[PDB]
Design a protein around this ligand. Sequence first.
Ligand SMILES: Cc1cc2nc3c(=O)[nH]c(=O)nc-3n(C[C@H](O)[C@H](O)[C@H](O)COP(=O)(O)OP(=O)(O)OC[C@H]3O[C@@H](n4cnc5c(N)ncnc54)[C@H](O)[C@@H]3O)c2cc1C
Length: 422
Amino acid sequence: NANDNVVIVGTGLAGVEVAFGLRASGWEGNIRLVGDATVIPHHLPPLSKAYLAGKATAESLYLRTPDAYAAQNIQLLGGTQVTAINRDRQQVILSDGRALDYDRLVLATGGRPRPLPVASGAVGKANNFRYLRTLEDAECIRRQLIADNRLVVIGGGYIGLEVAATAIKANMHVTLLDTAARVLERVTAPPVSAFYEHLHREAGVDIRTGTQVCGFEMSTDQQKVTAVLCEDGTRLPADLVIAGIGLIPNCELASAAGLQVDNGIVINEHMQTSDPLIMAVGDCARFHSQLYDRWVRIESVPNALEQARKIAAILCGKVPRDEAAPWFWSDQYEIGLKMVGLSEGYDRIIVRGSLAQPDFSVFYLQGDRVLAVDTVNRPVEFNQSKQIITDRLPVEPNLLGDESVPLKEIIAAAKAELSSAP
Ligand SMILES: Cc1cc2nc3c(=O)[nH]c(=O)nc-3n(C[C@H](O)[C@H](O)[C@H](O)COP(=O)(O)OP(=O)(O)OC[C@H]3O[C@@H](n4cnc5c(N)ncnc54)[C@H](O)[C@@H]3O)c2cc1C
């Protein structure tokens, strides 16, 4: 609006993508990015992959080159923590006491690592006990990915698995602990969890499921972890401990500002929070999925880009793209893993291919409806799966597992059934 000033809280992929999106959709007003992080906004996925492997330059991580902020006239204010929002005056209050005025406010606060209770005090503070979320976290762990050293990963989520895969490649003695009965218990089917556990075990990782960490042993001098103790009494000697038991959405700001909060900042079809002038986006945002007809909060890059762009369109009086099936990816041992949709509430699963090799797709179904698909080294079936989920195609369930029948044809028939037959 040439006059309307927009303020974005959070310099993560979400906030940065909103900033450049805005200026790309023809926003002439001023754009301010305020983030507590001091570093240059960078990519996160590399931190448990190539960067964690020391095979990518720090420079390749930048979301956008520093010149780009200048060129696009985007003001970046780092190392600054926003402590409050005054919806009334329409201001943002910094930790130094300063205040910024806004006509439009975007909350791209992401989330923070969920603290491991038995790791409070000295444990957490140790140089060899880290969580993985910041550039600093990554480099600190990378400096310690040492051959023959012993690593204990506490947490069996995708990042946990990606870390274990990188540490293994680095020839460390790796042990991964999960309280769940099987890795990725909540988001995949048993046979899928079996694939990962065998993949990693085969690779050398010792996975201990249904295992709980009661505490740690430490050295009095260095104040470093020396071992991980399990509830069952097992002692795991450790040189490095990487904890990851989930993410906590940063909602405090909206919470104290009277905005609706529920395991994330609540937004409507227009990305608006309880307050019309305030929008939320990214890992922090809880929105309604019309595709699944329920409130969700996605923590993924594609989710950030989709939401970010939508916000830019709206604020620029443009029309937002139609909701797209959610998806994300994971890279482990060079295996291309891509997942689309949300598997919650599935009745059965159908495996298209053999689970005895990284080359198959797993369709998650609730009745005859396909909820999600996890593909392993199948980029084309993944793209085709996107279509099915998004457009709710009536693909024939009994043909999904049959590999003699191309997925393209199964889809073609489903679309044909939609046209000529009621
Ligand atoms: C190691 C790792 C690997 C990943 N790999 C993948 C992957 O392979 N594929 C995929 O799809 N996704 C992956 N993700 C997730 C993906 O990176 C994120 O979902 C995406 O980048 C969106 O992040 P965000 O910007 O919403 O939140 P964040 O990246 O957390 O950004 C929010 C920023 O706002 C700051 N902030 C919060 N409150 C305030 C405040 N009051 N004042 C100032 N600043 C504040 C936060 O400190 C933070 O810097 C990975 C994440 C990690 C950590």
